[PDB]
Structures are given as structure tokens and as C-alpha cells.
Design a protein around this ligand. Structure first.
Ligand SMILES: CCCCCCCCCCCCCCCCC[C@@H](O)O[C@H](CO[C@H](O)CCCCCCCCCCCCCCC)COP(=O)(O)OCC[N+](C)(C)C
Ligand SMILES: CCCCCCCC/C=C\CCCCCCCC(=O)O[C@H](COC(=O)CCCCCCC/C=C/CCCCCCCC)COP(=O)(O)OCCN
Ligand SMILES: NC(=O)C1=CN([C@@H]2O[C@H](COP(=O)(O)OP(=O)(O)OC[C@H]3O[C@@H](n4cnc5c(N)ncnc54)[C@H](OP(=O)(O)O)[C@@H]3O)[C@@H](O)[C@H]2O)C=CC1
Ligand code: SF4
Ligand code: SF4
Ligand code: SF4
Ligand SMILES: [Zn+2]
Lengths: 63, 144, 115, 96, 297, 208, 156, 176
């Protein structure tokens, strides 16, 4: 009633992400630093995972 | 009865300045009603009211035949009404701009404009900011 | 250990059996799909596209992921058989209007900052 | 003060004008460029400086609840005037 | 390179490719494909139109917001051509009429207009000019079309020495006048044709725009297979399931396509020409209600 | 507690607590936790294997007979090992009451479909499969219900981008509607709104 | 000369005929359809302008896109537009149809109906009032009146 | 308390059966509907004569946007970016910098009218009454690009509609 299969979990084929947004992106796992403009620490309690910055350009119309 | 309504129709014909005015108003506005003149506009529009008509038909405007640059005997639109008569006509207020006029400012347009889409004076958007990064300019002198 | 609840298949053998069944059905359906939607592709290249889609997931070594893929492919087949899709949905597999992307390092260096 | 760029384009109140080599000027061909003729900086420079006999003066932009939030301006620096951070109006003590 | 003209993005609808193009005659059969291929990668396109703007509607969804600008022009005024190509670094000349009108003969359309366009572009500082001629264009042709095309090509080369002359060979496509004209019938065995795909010609024009070394060169866009006219016509009826332009066009279509191995072709632009057999069904499916024709090489 | 504060009803709180203890006693094989909120809402967190039994009890027991399925949805919490939580909201007209049942699952573990207990569940389950990828075993026909045909991915997952991966337009060269990688004329502006200086001391977590 | 006078008067007659009877088929996708039905209501009475109510796709002059166009719906709208005879015009009503509007940054919404079909008139608002849509229809009528086809044919 | 809508029982005596048969064979209720439609024909229609007549509006009506200025002629906007932060549709884009005289003014202020949902949140988040939603609603356009407003267009709108906008604000500011 249980397979008891022993393998590293990988659902990368079931989420529908394009292939070049999986093997090319580099995620950062970190606790965000406290904003030095303020003395509060409530924004440094959890962990954040984010993606690497890619190119941003200027729209020819309206800039 | 019938006689009274035909007499009222005859008075409607008479009150538009004769047969020529009757035909002009009938072919320009598809309406031949007569009401008390409330206001005259600096562009030529005329504004009439009739409080015995039901709400929405108690106020109307006969548009001018010539706005800023175009003939307007046939091609009329609602964007021609100046803002004060726009307020009075849409029943946002009970007072025409004649009894009490709007406050006068030095930046308010003295010349209203209609919708200028489809015309050379239409609006074209652009980015109103300056260039963020400036490039290096090489010297004009030779290096060797 | 890592005991897990099965979806459809107990091990990889039943998973491969289901994969073969699905491939059989898709290969059989291809020419009828080509004729019915009046596609400009041939039956040969449609079956090649089916083979390529099946090959895209060839590295999976998990029965649960495999039969989830089989279920999704079966739903896609049900969509394409009942003509719930249109020609656009079928032709979306071929990326005809996309510019070819060069994997060469020099080409990628010249075009922009994308690695 | 509406000015005109050497290429002919009107310079906006933000100082924006496409340079001579800019292709984007093609968008204004057979059409016009929208520029506001009233430059607020000049209009606020044309206002007189009001003299008040107090060290601190309050400004709400005029109109009460129809202006900006009420702020208090100090007038102890005799070298320059006190300017409202919202409206731009200038205030001064009666020097001499 | 004028920073605003630096490519940015991933070559998509909302990207910048640094190409400002003035496509004369963009309302025709090849103009729509050229404008589509230009706008797919985000280039700014200027469309000069003489017709009613209703006929230019189909070009509006071909680009992002503000990337396609329509301006009016006429072929006999130099100021219109001036204001249309003033800010463009690429000019494409697709102006051409298959017949004569009371206001334009072949002289006006194929000689005077291309020469004026090339001269105005050269004066204005346009970097690239792409002029379209015919494969069979020579001075000693019996047809006025080809003589005018050849004289216009020489005049364009004189006025704009760095122009790229592209000589397609009887373009066929969905809105073409070759497959449709032959299928609209409802002499042979001596005429041979070299039809070329419309998308192939569009890709060739775009690649020539992007090609740095193809500045003053001359290309010839031809199909892979040479077809005799009779055999080719038979295939058209067969695909369409049908049982088997005053004087100039019949003479032109009875002429055989030349062969210029000295001229570079579509391969040198990295394009593999597609056979007519594949796209014949696509074009001629609308004419309805498998044994490809034999070729000679 | 002056007029700006919501009034409290302790009678309903006591009734819901009593019924929660009652349900927990009757079905200890599946119930893992019972909670009542400060606004008198009763929720029961159960083991995934007890979807069909517990629901049936709540549908059929004389003292519960929760005969209406108001809603069935899922919540995505990536930080948990069991990523998805399934929520059943039930209404009983005889007792004028409402109950909530919670279950957990992950990507590769199928929940047993509850169409037999409630037919109304059917479409709801499809939606979950369309939005979170939760497979429901023994569903009469499990397929996408809201997304486009051929759409890849599940959009209501927390790791799905807001604007998706592809966008549609019309291409004249191929004379049809095509899908291309998504590019935005203006990128969505991400705002950092969360402020320091915690607001509610009652929810402060231990510093571990 | 008389040759251009004849085509000018023929243009005037044909333009008057085309703009004086506009038969719209409306894509009632979302809430802007409600304002369309209010423009068809007794107060505004689109029919009094010659603009009939709910024409058939095979006999419609103008297409009114009133609502959000989703990715699942774009092929159907394009097919219906292609089935329409010429001359044909498209009016984009509301923010959702103009540029996506409130759902612009969505995975299942087409960012503007002009990615699919060319648009003649853009009616702004969320939703535009019935008076606003009537103003857009009259502006389309003026645009039709401005056009000139026999003249273009004659001078070409 | 509940009501029964369809819980009536027809009487089975001869007179009522004859009445029902007469209704069936003579179509009485059909003539009743005909008569009601006929009566509706002989009353005044509710149609107004647009564009010469306009529908009623109110000072609170939200139409086209505008940027206002102080009576001295100085723009009210101080680049606080509250309207941009509150905008549900992300339709407002603002860039600012110190002016030549050190004033806090915007250098870029765009509103995408094809993104705007016309909720009026921007004009109620503004603390200086700079951005308002005017009463103009007849601003349909033939191209998409002209619905992408910038600072010049909005300032022109304010200068164009200031009289009516100020009158509406005077009429309705005591309810805010
Ligand atoms: C007998 C043989 C028959 C053969 C076919 C002939 C077709 C029938 C002929 C009858 C044609 C009827 C024409 C009547 C149109 C007049 C409408 C007039 O009022 O239009 C105004 C004038 O506009 C134009 O100037 C009118 C152009 C009409 C045609 C011009 C002359 C064409 C005559 C040529 C006939 C010869 C035909 C030969 C080939 C068949 C503008 O009004 P409009 O903008 O709408 O609406 C504005 C709404 N407002 C006023 C309430 C605000
Ligand atoms: C003593 C010797 C006398 C000689 C014999 C004379 C006997 C006369 C008495 C009886 C005759 C009456 C018959 C007249 C027609 C009866 C037909 C009829 O009743 O059909 C109705 C149905 O008829 C209709 O519904 C038709 C309505 C169509 C809609 C349009 C409404 C039309 C009314 C507008 C006015 C009509 C004007 C008629 C005269 C015009 C003359 C130019 C029954 O159908 P149901 O009620 O659905 O039940 C059947 C299942 N058990
Ligand atoms: N099979 C083929 O197509 C062959 C094409 N040729 C050449 O390729 C070029 C483009 O071909 P194609 O697009 O199919 O031809 P088209 O007739 O389809 O369109 C050519 C364009 O030129 C414009 N044009 C024509 N005459 C004038 C004029 N007097 N003034 C201004 N503009 C004018 C037309 O606009 P408007 O709508 O106003 O008429 C039209 O949009 C042509 O120069 C042709 O000679 C090369 C070999 C193959
Ligand atoms: S455009 Fe505005 S009113 Fe119309 S459906 Fe979309 S959100 Fe609703
Ligand atoms: S009205 Fe609403 S959606 Fe429009 S700009 Fe203001 S805040 Fe944004
Ligand atoms: S809220 Fe008012 S003052 Fe602040 S940025 Fe917006 S328009 Fe300017
Ligand atoms: Zn102040």
C-alpha cells in the first residue's frame, strides 16, 4: 500500500515552468536586512527566497 | 382636443422665426420645441430650458454653426459645450453661469476646445523626463 | 524508507506500461487530428512532435510524477479528440512565430545580458 | 516662460526636448507636441512677498479646507524669506 | 550609435531593436509581411500611405504602442518623401504597380519614384536603402515592365551607391497574384518558372537589413526548384481539385526566369528556401469545395 | 468595549465548543484538532484519509446533518511539507449552523474525491485541480475548468508569476492567434508595504 | 472638372448611407455590456440613430468589444471578426478592452483587444456611461463621414 | 414569515370551468396583454435628444482626470506619491526632483487611461487636492496612444476644466 520509493523529490516537470527559467535562474535564500532608516526589527523574522535580477529597459513610448 | 394641439403646433412653427427657422431647427436638432432662452455662448451656442418637460428634456442646447476652425452646421458633438454651460446642462447645478459666473483665474483657458482626436492638433504622448545616463565624449585631439 | 501513497502505479513497470499506452493512443490519433483541424503540418512531423514531447520527460525516475504526467497527457488527448481545442492550441506546440534562439556563447554575448 | 529648442521643439516646464539626432521626433510629424503654456515656477515667482509682524506665520494655501495642510513658517532669518513647502508663497518680517 | 537606437530586450513585441524603417508601399502583398517581420522584433516602423486609412487597418496590430506611425505621401512631391524618411535609418522601397493607370505608367512607378526616394534618402543621411527589382530585369527586354525596372535599378544605384538591390523571382504566397491568378482560370512546355515564398523574401529583407556586409551588394531571391509552366499549372489545379494584366502580364508570365549564379542568393543570408509543394495546399485551400510536379535543374 | 468594537456572543462560542468536543469524541480515528475562533467559527483539522467518513457523518448524523456544501477551496503555503490545505465549508439548515473541515496534502499525494457525499463538490474539485494541481482520486471527470486549453502550470500556486509565462496576440503571417513569451511594456511595480514595529502583540511568536 | 465632382458626390452619398445605418453586433463579455444595454434602453434609444439592436454577425457593420478579452476567448473573437463583411469597424469599450484595465497584469487576460483586431474608436471608462458609448458611436459616424474612397480610386 | 406564491386551487364548479374554457377558446388574457401594450403605446417616451440633451449628473461624478493648481498659478502636486501608492490598477507613474527654486515638484506624471478603473481613490488620497477626476466623460479617442496621458495633458485638462472642477469641489467638499 506504500511504494517506499527512495529518491530525491523533483517536481520540476509538473509545474509548467519553461526550461530556461529553471536551469538558468539563481535564487537567493536570505533573511532581509533591517532598513537602516528605521529601528524596528519586525521585518527580519522570516526567510525570503528571491530570484536574480534580469534586464530592465526603457519603453520607447512614454519612457 | 385636436384644435388645441394643432394650434400649439402652429405656434411652434411661428416661434422659430418662420418656415426657414422651423426647417433649420428640425433638420439640425430633430426637435422643434420652443423654450425660454436661458443663455448665449461666446462661441455661438444657445441654451434653452422648459421646466414643464420631464427631467432630462427640461434643458437643451442649440449648437453653433461654426466653432474654432470647423463648419458645424451638421457635425456637432457634446464636447463643444464650455465647462460652465457643461455644468448647468448636465444638471449638476440649478444655476446657469449667467446668474452666477465661475471664479476667474489667470490660467483658465479663455478658448474652449472640442475633442481634437483625428486632427493634426491631436495629443501625442512622450516621456517628459531627461536622459538618465550621459555618455563619455572622446577628445578631439590625437593621442599619438 | 520514505513510504508514499500511490496514485496509479506501484512501481516503474506499471508506469512504463501506462506511458506506452498513452504513446499508442497519441500516435494513433495524430493523423485524424491533422486532417480534422486542417493543419499545414504532415502526419510524420506531428508524430515527431509527439515523440519529442514524450522525450522531454525521459529523465523521470518517480512513478508518481510519471503517472501524473500520464494523466495530464490523457487530458490533453481528451481535449484534442473532442475538438475542444482550436487550431491555435494545436499549433502552439510548434512555435512557428518565435525567432530561433542561439545557444552559442558569442551570439548570447552579442545580443544582450541574458546568460 | 515657454522657450523653443534649437531644433524648433518647444521646451517643456521640466526642460524636456528631443535632441537633433533623436529619432523619436518622428512621432510629432504631421501632428503636434503637447506643452503647457503656463509655467508654475514663473507664476509663483511673480507673487509678492507678504509682510507680517510675527516670528511665526501659519499658511494653509488659502480656502481653509480646500488648501494644503496647515504649516508654520519661521521668520527669524533676516537674510532671506520664509517659503511655504506646499504653496510656494513667501513671507517676511518688516525689516527696518 | 545614438543610445536611443541601442537594442534592448529579448527581441519581442515590446523590445527595442534599433531599427527605424520607412517601408514605402507597405499596403501591398509584400509590405504587410515586411512590416509584420519588422514589428515582431520591436522595430519602429513608418508607413507612408496614399490610399484610404481604412485599407491600412491590418497593419495596426502588427506592433506595440507607438511603434507604427502612419503618414500620408505622394510619389510626385519630394517634401512628403523628405518628411517621411527624415528620422529613419532604414528605407525599404516596395512601391510597384503591375498595370498602368491614367496617372502613373511604369516610368513614374519604377524609375522616377525609386530615384527620388533614393536621392532624398541619400541627402537625409539614411544609412541603408533596400530597393526591390525583378529577377528578369534587363535593358533589352521586350516588356516595358522589365526595362523600366532595370532603368530604375541603375538610377537607384547611381543615386544611392550603398543601396541593396534585391531581385525576387515571382513571389508566391497567400495573397499572391501567381497561385491565385493561375487558379482563377476556371501555351506551355517552353516556359520555366522559379517561384519563391513570400515569407522567405520577408526574412531575406530583414536579414539584409541586419547584414553589415551586404551594403552595396545585389541579391536574387529564387526558389529551390525550377518548374516548367505546364507542369506547374497542372499542380495548381490538382491541389485545388479543379479539372484542367491586359498584354504586359501575359508576356511576362510567358517569359522564362533567368539564371544568375554570379549573384548571391537567399542561402548567403542564412535562409533555406522552402518548396512550393508544402505551401501550395495552404494558399489554394480556399479554392477547393500528393504527386508533386516534376522539376528541371 | 464602546460602540466601535464588534459585540461578542459567548453562548454560540460555548455551543460550538461543545459540538466540537462531541465530533472529536465520535471520530477519534481522523480528527487531529478542533478550534473555535473569537468570532464563533468552528473548524476541525483532520487526517487526509478521513475525508469521506467525517464528511459523511457531518452529512448524515441526526445531530449534525450538515446537508449543504457551501464552498470547497485550497490554500497554498510553500513553507510547509504538506504544501496545500483543503478547506470544506458546510452549512446545516436544521440547526442554523456552519462548520469547517481542514485537510492537508502535497503535490504528489491524491485526496479522495468527495462527489459521492456532495455532488456540489464536483466542479469545486476540478477548480482545485486547475489551480493547485491537487489530484482527486475517483473523480467522475477531472479536467481543467477555468484556464485555457493547453495551459501549462497551476496559476494559484504561490510560486506562479502574476502575469504568467506566455501571452497571446494575432499574427498575420500565420493568420492566427499565437502565444509568445511574455514581455511587459511597463513591469509590475512591487511595493514593500510591510512595516516594522509589530501591530498585534497577541500573535507574537516565540523567538526559538 | 465634372469627373471628380461625380465621384465626390457619390462618396458623400455612400458615406451618408453607410454611417446612417450602423448595425452592431456586441460582444457582451463583461459589465460593459450592461452599459451597452442601457444605451439601448428607452432613455438613449440607439435605434433612433439607425443603430439597430443585436444584429447578426453576417450582417453587422461594427463590432463592439465590451468586456475583458481573456486568452481562452481571443480565438473566438478573432474568428467572429473575420466572419464579418466589409466595410467593418471595431469599437473598444472600457478599460478592460482598451488595455486590460484592472486585470492588465494577469496570466489569462489579453492586454487590449487591439492585439487581436484593429480598433477604430476607443471608449474610455470603467464602465463608460451610456452617453459615453453613444458619443463614441457618433464619433465613429463622423470618422466614416470623413473617409473618401471613390476619390482615392479616381486619383490613383 | 413566509409566503406561498403558487398554492391556489381552481374551483371545479360549472361556472368556473366554463370561464376557463372561454379563456382558452377566446384568448382573453392575450387581448389583455395586447391592451396593456396598446396603452403603453399612447404615452410619452422616455428618450432624451442627445447630444442636444444630456443625462443628469452630480458633483461626485468621476470622469476624466486633471491636475489642479493654486490661485497663484502654482501646481498643487508635491510628488508625495500617495495617489500612485493607492492606485488599484497601477495606472499612475511619478518621477520627481527638486525644482530650480528648490520646490518639490514632479518631472513625470503619467496616467494610463486604458489601465485606470475610475474608482476615484487617487483624488481622495491626495492631501492637497492636486489630482482630481473631473466631470468630462466625452473623451473617446481613435488611437490607443492618445489615452496614455502625461503631465502636460493632465495640466492642460486642469487649465481647461478648472471652473467646473472648482465648482463641483465647492459643492461637494463638505461631505468629505
Ligand atoms: C431613382 C434612381 C435610384 C438609383 C439609386 C439612387 C439612390 C437613392 C437616391 C436618394 C438619396 C437620398 C439622399 C438624402 C441624404 C440627405 C441627408 C442630410 O441631412 O445629410 C446632411 C448633409 O450631409 C451631407 O452633405 C449629405 C450627403 C448626401 C449625398 C450628397 C449628394 C448625392 C446625390 C447623388 C445622387 C445620384 C446617384 C447616381 C448613382 C446611383 C448631414 O446630416 P448627418 O451628418 O447625416 O446627421 C447629423 C445629425 N444631426 C444633424 C442631428 C446632428
Ligand atoms: C350553435 C351553432 C354554432 C356553430 C358552431 C360555432 C362554435 C363556436 C364556439 C367555439 C369556436 C372557438 C374556436 C376559435 C379558435 C380556438 C382555437 C384555440 O382555442 O386554440 C387555443 C390556443 O390558441 C392560441 O393560443 C393562439 C394564440 C396565438 C398568439 C397570438 C394571439 C392572437 C390574439 C390577437 C387577436 C386575434 C385576432 C383574431 C381575428 C382576426 C380577424 C382578421 C388552445 O390552445 P391551448 O390553450 O394551448 O390548449 C390546448 C391544449 N389543451
Ligand atoms: N510576385 C511578386 O509579387 C513580384 C513583385 N515584384 C516587385 O516587388 C515590389 C512589391 O511587390 P508587391 O507588394 O506584391 O506589389 P503590390 O501591388 O501588392 O503593392 C505595392 C505597393 O506599392 C504601392 N504603390 C503602388 N503604386 C504606387 C504609387 N504610384 N505611389 C505610391 N505608392 C504606390 C501600393 O499601395 P496602394 O494600395 O495605394 O496601391 C502598394 O501598396 C514591387 O515593386 C514589385 O514590382 C518583384 C518580383 C515578384
Ligand atoms: S471595463 Fe470596467 S466596468 Fe467594464 S467590465 Fe471591465 S472592470 Fe467592469
Ligand atoms: S481613479 Fe483609481 S484606478 Fe484611476 S488613477 Fe485614480 S486610483 Fe488609479
Ligand atoms: S497625491 Fe496629490 S500631491 Fe501626492 S503625488 Fe498624487 S497628485 Fe501629487
Ligand atoms: Zn502655502
Amino acid at each position: 500500500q506504500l511504494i517506499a520509493v527512495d529518491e530525491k523529490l523533483d517536481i520540476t516537470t509538473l509545474t509548467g515552468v519553461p526550461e530556461e527559467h529553471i536551469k538558468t535562474r539563481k535564487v537567493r535564500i536570505f533573511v532581509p536586512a533591517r532598513n537602516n532608516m528605521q529601528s524596528g526589527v519586525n521585518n527580519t523574522k522570516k526567510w525570503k527566497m528571491e530570484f536574480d535580477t534580469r534586464e530592465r529597459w526603457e519603453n520607447p513610448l512614454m519612457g | 382636443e385636436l384644435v388645441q394641439v394643432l394650434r400649439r403646433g402652429l405656434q411652434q412653427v411661428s416661434g422659430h422665426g418662420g418656415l426657414r427657422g422651423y426647417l433649420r431647427v428640425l433638420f439640425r436638432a430633430n426637435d422643434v420645441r420652443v423654450g425660454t432662452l436661458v443663455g448665449e455662448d461666446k462661441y455661438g451656442n444657445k441654451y434653452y430650458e422648459d421646466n414643464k418637460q420631464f427631467f432630462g428634456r427640461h434643458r437643451w442646447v442649440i449648437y453653433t454653426t461654426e466653432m474654432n476652425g470647423r463648419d458645424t452646421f451638421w457635425d456637432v458633438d457634446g464636447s463643444m459645450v464650455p465647462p460652465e454651460w457643461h455644468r448647468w446642462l448636465h444638471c449638476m447645478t440649478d444655476d446657469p453661469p449667467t446668474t452666477k459666473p465661475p471664479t476667474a483665474r489667470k490660467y483658465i483657458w479663455t478658448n474652449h476646445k472640442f475633442n481634437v482626436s483625428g486632427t493634426p492638433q491631436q495629443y501625442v504622448p512622450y516621456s517628459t523626463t531627461r536622459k538618465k545616463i550621459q555618455e563619455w565624449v572622446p577628445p578631439s585631439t590625437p593621442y599619438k | 524508507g520514505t513510504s508514499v501513497k500511490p496514485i496509479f502505479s506501484r512501481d516503474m513497470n506499471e508506469a512504463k506500461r501506462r506511458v506506452r499506452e498513452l504513446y499508442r493512443a497519441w500516435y494513433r490519433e495524430v493523423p485524424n487530428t491533422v486532417h480534422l483541424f486542417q493543419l499545414d503540418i504532415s502526419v510524420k512531423q506531428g508524430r515527431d512532435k509527439v515523440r519529442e514531447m514524450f522525450m522531454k520527460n525521459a529523465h523521470v525516475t518517480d512513478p508518481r510524477v510519471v503517472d501524473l504526467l500520464v494523466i495530464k497527457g490523457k487530458m490533453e488527448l481528451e481535449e484534442t479528440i473532442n475538438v475542444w481545442k482550436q487550431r491555435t492550441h494545436i499549433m502552439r506546440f510548434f512555435h512557428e512565430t518565435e525567432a530561433p534562439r542561439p545557444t552559442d556563447f558569442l551570439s548570447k554575448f552579442y545580443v544582450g545580458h541574458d546568460p | 516662460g515657454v522657450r523653443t529648442s534649437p531644433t524648433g521643439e518647444k521646451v517643456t516646464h521640466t526642460g524636456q526636448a528631443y535632441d537633433d539626432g533623436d529619432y523619436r521626433r518622428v512621432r510629432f510629424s504631421d501632428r503636434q507636441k503637447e506643452v503647457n503654456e503656463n509655467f508654475a515656477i514663473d507664476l509663483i515667482a511673480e507673487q509678492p512677498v507678504s509682510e507680517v509682524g510675527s516670528r511665526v506665520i501659519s499658511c494653509d494655501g488659502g480656502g481653509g479646507a480646500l488648501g494644503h495642510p496647515r504649516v508654520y513658517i519661521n521668520l527669524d532669518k533676516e537674510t532671506k524669506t520664509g517659503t511655504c513647502g506646499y504653496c510656494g508663497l513667501q513671507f517676511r518680517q518688516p525689516h527696518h | 550609435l545614438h543610445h536611443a537606437l541601442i537594442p534592448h530586450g529579448k527581441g519581442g513585441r515590446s523590445s527595442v531593436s534599433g531599427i527605424v524603417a520607412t517601408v514605402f508601399g507597405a499596403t501591398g502583398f509584400l509590405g504587410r509581411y515586411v512590416v509584420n517581420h519588422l514589428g515582431r522584433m520591436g522595430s519602429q516602423v513608418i508607413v507612408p500611405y496614399r490610399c484610404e486609412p481604412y485599407d491600412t487597418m491590418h497593419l495596426r496590430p502588427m506592433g506595440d504602442l507607438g511603434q507604427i506611425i502612419f503618414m500620408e505621401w505622394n510619389g510626385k512631391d519630394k517634401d512628403s518623401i523628405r518628411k517621411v524618411v527624415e528620422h529613419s535609418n532604414v528605407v525599404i522601397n516596395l512601391v510597384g504597380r503591375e498595370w498602368e493607370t491614367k496617372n502613373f505608367d511604369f516610368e513614374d512607378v519604377f524609375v522616377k519614384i525609386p530615384h527620388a526616394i533614393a536621392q532624398v534618402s541619400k541627402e537625409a543621411g539614411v544609412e541603408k536603402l533596400i530597393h526591390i527589382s525583378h529577377l528578369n530585369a534587363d535593358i533589352k527586354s521586350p516588356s516595358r515592365y522589365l526595362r523600366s525596372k532595370a532603368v530604375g535599378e541603375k538610377e537607384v544605384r547611381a543615386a544611392f551607391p550603398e543601396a541593396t538591390i534585391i531581385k525576387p523571382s515571382d513571389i508566391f504566397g497567400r495573397e499572391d497574384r501567381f497561385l491565385n491568378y493561375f487558379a482563377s482560370m476556371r501555351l506551355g512546355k517552353e516556359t520555366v518558372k522559379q517561384p519563391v515564398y513570400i515569407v522567405d523574401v520577408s526574412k531575406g529583407i530583414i536579414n539584409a537589413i541586419k547584414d553589415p556586409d551586404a551594403k552595396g551588394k545585389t541579391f536574387a531571391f529564387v526558389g529551390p526548384n525550377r518548374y516548367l509552366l505546364f507542369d506547374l499549372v497542372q499542380y495548381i489545379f490538382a491541389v485545388a481539385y479543379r479539372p484542367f494584366t491586359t498584354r504586359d502580364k501575359v508576356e511576362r508570365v510567358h517569359m522564362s526566369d533567368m539564371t544568375l549564379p554570379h549573384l548571391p542568393g537567399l542561402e548567403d543570408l542564412g535562409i533555406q528556401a522552402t518548396p512550393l509543394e508544402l505551401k501550395a495546399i495552404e494558399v489554394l485551400r480556399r479554392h477547393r469545395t500528393v504527386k508533386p510536379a516534376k522539376t528541371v535543374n | 468595549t464602546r460602540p466601535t468594537i464588534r459585540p461578542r456572543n459567548d453562548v454560540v462560542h460555548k455551543q460550538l465548543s461543545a459540538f466540537g468536543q462531541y465530533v472529536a469524541e465520535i471520530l477519534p480515528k481522523y480528527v487531529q484538532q478542533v478550534q473555535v475562533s473569537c468570532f464563533n467559527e468552528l473548524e476541525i483539522f483532520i487526517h487526509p484519509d478521513g475525508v469521506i467518513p467525517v464528511l459523511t457523518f457531518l452529512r448524515d448524523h441526526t445531530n449534525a446533518q450538515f446537508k449543504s456544501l457551501a464552498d470547497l477551496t485550497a490554500v497554498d503555503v510553500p513553507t510547509r511539507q504538506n504544501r496545500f490545505e483543503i478547506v470544506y465549508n458546510l452549512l446545516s439548515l436544521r440547526f442554523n449552523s456552519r462548520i469547517r473541515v481542514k485537510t492537508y496534502t502535497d503535490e504528489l499525494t491524491p485526496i479522495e474525491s468527495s462527489v459521492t457525499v456532495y455532488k456540489a463538490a464536483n466542479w469545486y474539485e476540478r477548480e482545485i485541480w486547475d489551480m493547485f494541481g491537487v489530484f482527486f482520486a475517483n473523480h467522475p471527470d477531472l479536467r481543467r475548468i477555468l484556464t485555457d486549453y493547453g495551459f501549462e502550470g497551476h496559476p494559484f500556486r504561490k510560486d506562479f508569476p502574476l502575469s504568467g509565462y506566455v501571452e497571446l496576440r494575432y499574427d498575420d503571417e500565420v493568420k492566427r492567434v499565437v502565444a509568445e513569451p511574455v514581455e511587459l511594456a511597463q513591469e509590475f511595480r512591487k511595493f514593500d508595504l510591510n512595516s516594522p514595529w509589530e501591530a498585534f502583540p497577541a500573535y507574537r511568536q516565540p523567538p526559538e | 472638372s465634372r469627373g471628380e465632382y461625380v465621384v465626390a458626390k457619390l462618396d458623400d452619398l455612400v458615406n451618408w448611407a453607410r454611417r446612417s445605418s450602423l448595425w452592431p453586433m456586441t460582444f457582451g463579455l463583461a459589465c460593459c455590456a450592461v452599459e451597452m444595454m442601457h444605451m439601448a434602453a428607452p432613455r438613449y434609444d440607439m435605434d433612433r440613430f439607425g443603430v439597430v439592436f443585436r444584429a447578426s454577425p453576417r450582417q453587422s457593420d461594427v463590432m463592439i468589444v465590451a468586456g475583458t478579452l481573456t486568452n481562452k476567448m481571443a480565438p473566438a473573437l478573432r474568428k467572429v471578426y473575420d466572419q464579418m463583411p466589409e466595410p467593418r469597424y471595431v469599437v473598444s469599450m472600457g478599460s478592460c478592452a482598451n488595455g486590460g484595465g484592472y486585470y492588465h497584469y494577469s496570466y489569462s487576460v489579453v492586454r487590449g483587444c487591439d492585439r487581436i483586431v484593429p480598433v477604430d474608436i476607443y471608449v474610455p471608462g470603467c464602465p463608460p456611461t451610456a452617453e459615453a458609448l453613444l458619443y463614441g458611436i457618433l464619433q465613429l459616424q463622423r470618422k466614416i463621414k470623413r473617409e473618401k474612397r471613390l476619390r482615392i480610386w479616381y486619383r490613383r | 414569515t413566509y409566503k406561498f406564491v403558487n398554492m391556489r386551487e381552481p374551483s371545479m364548479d360549472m361556472k368556473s370551468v366554463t370561464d376557463r374554457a372561454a379563456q382558452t377558446l377566446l384568448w382573453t388574457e392575450l387581448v389583455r396583454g395586447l391592451g396593456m401594450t396598446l396603452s403603453y403605446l399612447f404615452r410619452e417616451p422616455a428618450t432624451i435628444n442627445y447630444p442636444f440633451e444630456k443625462g443628469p449628473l452630480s458633483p461626485r461624478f468621476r470622469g476624466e482626470h486633471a491636475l489642479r493648481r493654486y490661485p497663484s498659478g502654482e501646481e498643487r502636486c508635491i510628488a508625495c506619491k500617495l495617489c500612485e501608492a493607492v492606485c488599484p490598477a497601477q495606472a499612475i507613474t511619478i518621477e520627481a526632483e527638486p525644482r530650480a527654486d528648490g520646490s518639490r515638484r514632479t518631472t513625470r506624471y503619467d496616467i494610463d487611461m486604458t489601465k485606470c478603473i475610475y474608482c476615484g481613490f487617487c483624488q481622495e488620497a491626495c492631501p492637497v487636492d492636486a489630482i482630481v477626476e473631473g466631470p468630462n466623460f466625452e473623451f473617446s479617442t481613435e488611437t490607443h496612444e492618445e489615452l496614455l496621458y502625461n503631465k502636460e495633458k493632465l495640466l492642460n485638462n486642469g487649465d481647461k476644466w478648472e471652473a467646473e472642477i472648482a465648482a463641483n469641489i465647492q459643492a461637494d467638499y463638505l461631505y468629505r
